[PDB]
Design a protein around this ligand. Structure first.
Ligand SMILES: [Zn+2]
Ligand SMILES: [Zn+2]
Ligand SMILES: [Zn+2]
Lengths: 115, 62, 531, 109, 105, 118, 250, 81
């Protein structure tokens, strides 16, 4: 904002991290039902953590409810709470499920279409 | 090949030669040779360079 | 009050119980006769001494302007239904009702139309006739225009339908003047050019040559080669297949015409091809210099084609202009600068002997004397460049001895024509430039450190107490590209008169003078060089 | 009308046109130009090609005034090509078919 | 102030609020740190002008008493065109001398 | 301290054509560009920006040109710092000053509008 | 190594010297530039100014200037004329004779108006006797040792000097032209030196310089060279527009 | 290391607040590309290079303006790779 002697650490990670695979196809949120996903997110993380962390839950929710989310930024922000590779796998697992739900006509992922 | 500035830091002889050749071509380009360019029309209105002009001039004809 | 004398002079004054302050000019050594006449919303005075000189305040501005007609004898105002306002003017064996038109003016115009953009013109000195080249990108030469108009009518006929419906005749007979509907012209590499010999008295066009479809005319010169007699020839450089923004050409030609019928009709002699657009031609000691791209060749007149008598290959970029004082040649190219060049006559050489220290997109030049050049810039600047006193005229980063730049000024608009000349009779020399937005200005030398210093102080104090209107800084403006050097702003100095007299007196007190003397000293300079 | 760098349609039914090169014009409006045998194009009308028209001299405008202007001055020369003792300015001027050669002299006509 | 490399400006967009000087700081420029030929007045960022920050020394931070100017040299090189020149950080020297004193007496 | 003198002297004599003097002193101030003392290097920087407004940006760019793409990197560091400071103030006056840089195989580096003749 | 791939890109110096249009410009390390074609093209542009010599030097800049001793600054002539120098010398020597006692005594009882200097001489010295020094043209950077270069490129014999003619046994001053250097005798004898076909000798190949005399006594210009027909051997040993400035103050 | 990325910091700042600056790692492409873009924005500001160009070709100032602003998105080829 006012300082020059510090670098943008986000951009630095934007260069120097190892990211997930589905993180390219931009995604909109109008086309999505979330309240179907929400329990999936909850159980996913709660297992990753062995306990429940409401704040991480709501963090992911709030980062998603935007018009179009940045998968890069989201993987970064979860890298702290989860163990880094867990974040890569988790995001590259949810984001394709997002693509599925969004090309679905009801907006729901094919996993819960089947189940 | 004259020990001039252009060949400093060149050490291999084949390189010095080749470079000297292209530099010969360069200076030849920028030089002005009247003998080859200066174009002369004869009394018959067609063009020669001044070389042939003076040639056939004193050669009894031009 | 106004007092005109009999050896043509007249002085104006205020009147209060004492004649306040005087001003004086001259109007031919013959009696200044005076006549009150109503003019354009004002009373004004005529004067006749040897020329009709109307004296009047234009929105409180005393301009004393000639008007253009023969000598006069007497006059006075006049009105009628036939003439809402005019002048009864009796002159040699005549009485005339005259009318004075547009009064807000310094020059008055008369326009002779043309067909395309005129890129250059030259005066033939005997018959006083203007040879004019004209060129237009992305156009159609006239022949081609009519031909392919015809051809599209050919297509249109073929609609196979009622045959009966013939818009052909209507099409080919309808002729929408381009002067009002625009030129029906397009293409991207398509040029269209023309030559025209015109008389300057009235717009009668003594002759008109029409070049082919993509032959574009870029330079013209009128000269006498010495190997023939007093035969005046006319040379016209012409590019062929030019493309503009990528750049490329097919190549140039130099058309030669004999300029016969005492100077009112061209006649083609020969076109000698050349390897790039000949953007500059100059007569030079009985032969002709020609810039061709980067090469600078000296040609002489051969009677099948032009002959290459000399050449230089060192000019930097692309020759845009060529001038010659008696034996020096100032080449001026498109991005570096002016380049001086010496013609070693007997040894037959063109040797570069000085150049410039700055990069500068010249668009025009003019020699002030043997040692000095003045140049304009594609960006708005004007410079004056001089050769240092001890230059070695004849010898035998990249140059030898450089030239010092002794003035620099940002005019504001591209200046495309400079010329050193005198305007009023008897008045002193000045350097007149004409911009590309329609402006005309002059630059005038100072003759006395006292003058120069008075004016330096006037403008220095105006800069501070009467700043530019829209926010800018005057010094920063005039130093837009290179900082100012040895020029003063008459346009800013002459805003004293429109300042508010409290401020007038503050400035004239910084000078320790009065607004009247300050204003008189503002206008004497204006008067001894220009209008 | 000439190509313009500004059209300023006043009240009083005047219309200023500031041509980009050459002289400026003050026109006066006569009719809003409607309901005649002139076609009318529309955004609901379909076509599969474009609709057309054909230009003609002025109908809705009458040229009231014309301001002279030297813009652009592609060349100039101060000479004495008359017999007068003063020099005239031979200005090669204007663009395109509106180009000109104007002679200027410090006088009044 | 051209003397202490450790400090920083607000640098955010200008405003209309004139700038003010403390009595220690009175009279000098704000960048050039000169003492002479002051030409133009200082205008400060609205944020750096809001609330408690009104009427203070741009440099010192104390109670502003006089209007801050720019020297003619800053005006000519156009260093007055960068938005709020308020130093937004205290520096080492203030707290340093303060602690040396509060230990001394 | 002679560099500080030159800074203030240029800012003062701006506009009066005392320019060959200032250029001559540029020839002596310029070699001090490879210094490392904070105070000597920022005195020289102040001098070069005073001289930019008084000598103009052409000269300053004729001085910065050859070292922007140098083999080394200390000299690229210094030259790009100087060039940035010439650029930031008077970045418009420079349009007329840049040098002609030819076009290679794939891109076109030449500005042709500036070679339109008219 | 991708570093060694960039190194595999690195032309040889003869590669560079070949491709570029001006090879002189190319130096050794120019090969190591991430843009060598640009770099050389920018080194070949007109009017630009080459990097300072000492970027590679291991010693710093005038830290190397170190060793020798130097004479004090030398005042301009127009400032010498006013005699401030000897004035301040007098006071320096007086005050060096002073001791601490007398120093404090004059601190407490000054000798006001002891000495003075007049104005109008300072005013003439700055506003009426000033002169432009010899300045340097654009691009003459300074380097350590530039000021201990005599000069060079001075190929002309006409250029004579004062120390030269003195230790030649020839006079300097206004009679320099009428003063023949020891070279003109054998110049008339066997031509000019055969690198200088194009040098003209004062008194031997050119006319007598004004008011100098052909002759063979002490101070003359000899018996001028000519052939057996009467044609001079070199040049002529016997001597067979409107340049006004345009806008200038009266 | 320290000085390296701290001046890399200050220069990222300079550039990002001032498009067009450089650093020790500036390529020929981006140099000349900023140089072109500035040239265009100034042909558009300056009311008289706009005339010069509109007269040199045969267009109108609005079309010339439009063309410049079209070119301003890739004036020198595609990027380096
Ligand atoms: Zn304070
Ligand atoms: Zn300041
Ligand atoms: Zn702020």
């Amino acid at each position: 904002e006012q300082d020059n002697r510090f670098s943008n650490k986000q951009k630095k990670l934007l260069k120097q991290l190892k990211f997930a695979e589905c993180l390219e196809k931009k995604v909109d949120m109008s086309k999505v039902n979330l309240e179907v996903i929400k329990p999936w997110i909850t159980k996913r993380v709660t297992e990753i953590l062995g306990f429940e962390d409401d704040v991480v839950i709501e963090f992911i929710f709030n980062q998603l409810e935007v018009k179009n989310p940045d998968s890069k930024m989201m993987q970064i922000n979860l890298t702290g709470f989860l163990n880094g590779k867990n974040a890569r796998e988790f995001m590259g697992e949810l984001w394709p499920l997002l693509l599925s739900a969004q090309e679905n006509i009801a907006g729901i992922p094919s996993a819960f279409l089947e189940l | 090949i004259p020990n001039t500035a252009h060949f400093a830091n060149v050490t291999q002889i084949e390189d010095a030669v080749s470079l000297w050749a292209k530099l010969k071509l360069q200076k030849a380009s920028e030089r002005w040779q009247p003998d080859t360019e200066e174009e002369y029309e004869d009394s018959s209105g067609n063009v020669v360079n001044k070389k042939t002009y003076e040639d056939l001039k004193r050669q009894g004809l031009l | 009050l106004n007092i005109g004398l009999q050896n043509g002079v007249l002085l104006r004054t205020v009147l209060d119980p004492v004649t306040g302050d005087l001003s004086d000019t001259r109007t031919g050594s013959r009696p200044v006769k005076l006549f009150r006449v109503r003019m354009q919303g004002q009373e004004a005075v005529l004067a006749m001494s040897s020329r009709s000189w109307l004296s009047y305040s234009y929105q409180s501005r005393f301009h004393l302007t000639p008007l253009s007609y023969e000598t006069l004898e007497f006059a006075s105002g006049f009105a009628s239904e036939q003439c809402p306002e005019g002048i009864v003017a009796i002159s040699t064996n005549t009485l005339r009702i005259l009318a004075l038109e547009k009064l807000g003016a310094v020059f008055n115009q008369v326009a002779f139309p043309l067909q395309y953009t005129p890129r250059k013109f030259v005066i033939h000195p005997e018959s006083n006739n203007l040879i004019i080249i004209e060129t237009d990108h992305n156009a159609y030469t006239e022949a081609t225009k009519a031909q392919r108009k015809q051809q599209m009518a050919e297509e249109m006929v073929e609609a196979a339908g009622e045959l009966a419906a013939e818009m052909a005749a209507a099409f080919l007979n309808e002729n929408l003047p381009e002067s009002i509907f625009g030129a029906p012209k397009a293409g991207n590499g398509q040029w269209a050019s023309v030559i025209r010999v015109m008389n300057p008295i009235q717009g009668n066009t003594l002759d008109l040559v029409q070049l082919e479809q993509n032959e574009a005319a870029f330079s013209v010169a009128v000269c006498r080669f010495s190997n023939t007699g007093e035969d005046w020839y006319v040379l016209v450089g012409v590019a062929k297949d030019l493309i503009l923004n990528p750049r490329s050409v097919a190549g140039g030609f130099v058309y030669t015409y004999k300029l016969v019928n005492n100077g009112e009709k061209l006649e083609f002699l020969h076109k000698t091809p050349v390897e790039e657009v000949p953007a500059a031609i100059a007569p030079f000691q009985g032969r002709v210099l020609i810039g061709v791209g980067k090469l600078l060749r000296v040609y002489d007149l051969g009677k099948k084609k032009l002959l290459r008598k000399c050449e230089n290959k060192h000019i930097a970029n692309y020759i845009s202009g060529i001038q010659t004082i008696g034996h020096r040649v100032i080449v001026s190219d498109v991005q570096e600068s002016f380049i001086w060049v010496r013609y070693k006559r007997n040894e037959n050489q063109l040797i570069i002997f000085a150049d410039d220290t700055y990069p500068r997109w010249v668009t025009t030049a003019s020699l002030l004397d043997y040692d000095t050049v003045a140049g304009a810039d594609k960006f708005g600047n004007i410079c004056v460049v001089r050769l240092p006193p001890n230059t070695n005229d004849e010898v035998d980063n990249g140059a030898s001895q450089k030239a010092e730049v002794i003035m620099n000024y940002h005019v504001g608009e591209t200046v495309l024509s400079l010329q050193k000349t005198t305007l009023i009779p008897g008045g002193s020399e000045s350097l007149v430039y004409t911009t590309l937005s329609g402006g005309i200005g002059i630059l005038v030398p100072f003759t006395s450190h006292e003058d120069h210093d008075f004016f330096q102080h006037v403008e220095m104090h105006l800069r501070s107490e009467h700043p530019p209107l829209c926010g800018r800084d005057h010094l920063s403006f005039r130093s837009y590209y290179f900082p100012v050097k040895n020029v003063i702003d008459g346009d800013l100095c002459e805003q004293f008169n429109s300042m508010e007299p409290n401020k007038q007196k503050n400035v004239s007190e910084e000078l320790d003078r009065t607004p009247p003397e300050v204003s008189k000293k503002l206008e004497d300079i204006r008067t001894r060089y220009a209008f | 009308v000439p190509v313009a760098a500004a059209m300023c349609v006043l009240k009083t039914g005047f219309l200023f046109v500031a041509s980009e090169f050459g002289n400026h014009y003050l026109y006066q409006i006569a009719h809003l130009g409607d309901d005649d045998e002139e076609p009318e194009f529309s955004s609901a009308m379909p076509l599969e090609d474009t609709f057309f028209f054909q230009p003609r001299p002025l109908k809705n405008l009458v040229l009231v005034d014309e301001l002279d202007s030297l813009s652009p001055i592609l060349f100039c020369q101060i000479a004495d090509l008359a017999n007068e003792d003063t020099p005239q300015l031979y200005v090669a001027c204007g663009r395109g078919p509106r180009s000109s050669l104007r002679v200027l002299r410090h006088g009044l006509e | 102030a051209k003397h202490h490399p450790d400090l920083i400006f607000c640098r955010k967009q200008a405003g209309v609020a004139i700038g003010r000087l403390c009595e220690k700081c009175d009279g000098k420029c704000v960048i050039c740190d000169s003492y002479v030929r002051p030409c133009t007045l200082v205008r400060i960022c609205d944020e750096c002008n809001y609330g408690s920050y009104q009427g203070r020394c741009v440099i010192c931070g104390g109670p502003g008493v006089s209007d801050a100017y720019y020297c003619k040299e800053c005006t000519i090189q156009e260093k007055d065109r960068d938005g709020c020149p308020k130093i937004v950080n205290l520096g080492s020297s203030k707290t340093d001398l303060f602690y040396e004193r509060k230990k001394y007496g | 301290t002679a560099s500080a003198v030159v800074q203030h002297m240029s800012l003062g004599v701006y506009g009066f054509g005392c320019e060959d003097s200032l250029n001559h002193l540029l020839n002596y101030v310029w070699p001090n560009v490879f210094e490392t003392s904070p105070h000597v290097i920022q005195a020289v920087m102040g001098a070069l920006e005073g001289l930019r407004v008084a000598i103009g940006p052409c000269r300053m760019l004729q001085y910065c040109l050859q070292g922007l793409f140098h083999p080394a990197r200390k000299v690229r560091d210094v030259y790009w710092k100087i060039y940035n400071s010439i650029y930031i103030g008077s970045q418009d006056a420079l349009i007329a000053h840049y040098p002609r840089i030819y076009n290679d195989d794939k891109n076109t580096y030449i500005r042709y509008e500036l070679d339109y003749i008219l | 190594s991708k570093k060694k791939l960039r190194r595999m890109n690195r032309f040889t110096v003869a590669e560079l010297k070949q491709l570029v249009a001006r090879p002189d410009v190319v130096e050794m390390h120019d090969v190591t530039a991430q843009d060598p074609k640009l770099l050389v093209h920018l080194k070949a542009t007109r009017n630009s100014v080459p990097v300072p010599r000492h970027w590679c030097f291991k010693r710093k800049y005038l830290q190397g200037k170190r060793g020798i001793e130097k004479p004090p600054f030398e005042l301009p002539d127009f400032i010498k004329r006013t005699g401030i120098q000897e004035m301040r010398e007098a006071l320096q020597e007086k005050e060096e004779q002073k001791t601490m006692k007398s120093k404090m005594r004059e601190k407490v009882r000054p000798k006001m108006g002891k000495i003075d200097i007049d104005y109008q001489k300072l005013h003439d010295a700055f506003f009426k006797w000033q002169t432009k020094p010899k300045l340097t043209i654009h691009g003459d950077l300074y380097y350590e040792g530039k000021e201990f270069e005599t000069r060079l490129k001075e190929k002309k014999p006409g250029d004579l000097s004062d120390e030269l003619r003195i230790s030649l046994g020839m006079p300097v001053g206004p009679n320099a032209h009428k003063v023949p250097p020891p070279w003109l005798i054998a110049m008339q004898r066997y031509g000019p030196p055969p690198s200088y076909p194009n040098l003209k000798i004062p008194g031997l190949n050119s006319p007598i310089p004004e008011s100098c005399s052909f002759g063979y006594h002490a101070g003359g210009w000899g018996k001028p060279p000519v052939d057996e027909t009467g044609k001079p051997l070199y040049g002529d040993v016997f001597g067979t527009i409107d340049r006004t400035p345009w806008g200038e103050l009266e | 290391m320290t000085d390296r990325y701290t001046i890399h910091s200050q220069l990222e700042h300079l550039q990002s607040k001032y498009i067009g600056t450089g650093h020790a790692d500036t390529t020929k492409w981006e140099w000349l590309v900023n140089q072109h873009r500035d040239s265009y924005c100034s042909y558009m500001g300056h009311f008289d290079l706009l005339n010069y160009f509109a007269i040199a070709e045969n267009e109108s100032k609005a079309r010339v303006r439009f063309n410049l602003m079209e070119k301003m998105l890739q004036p020198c080829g595609p990027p380096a790779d």
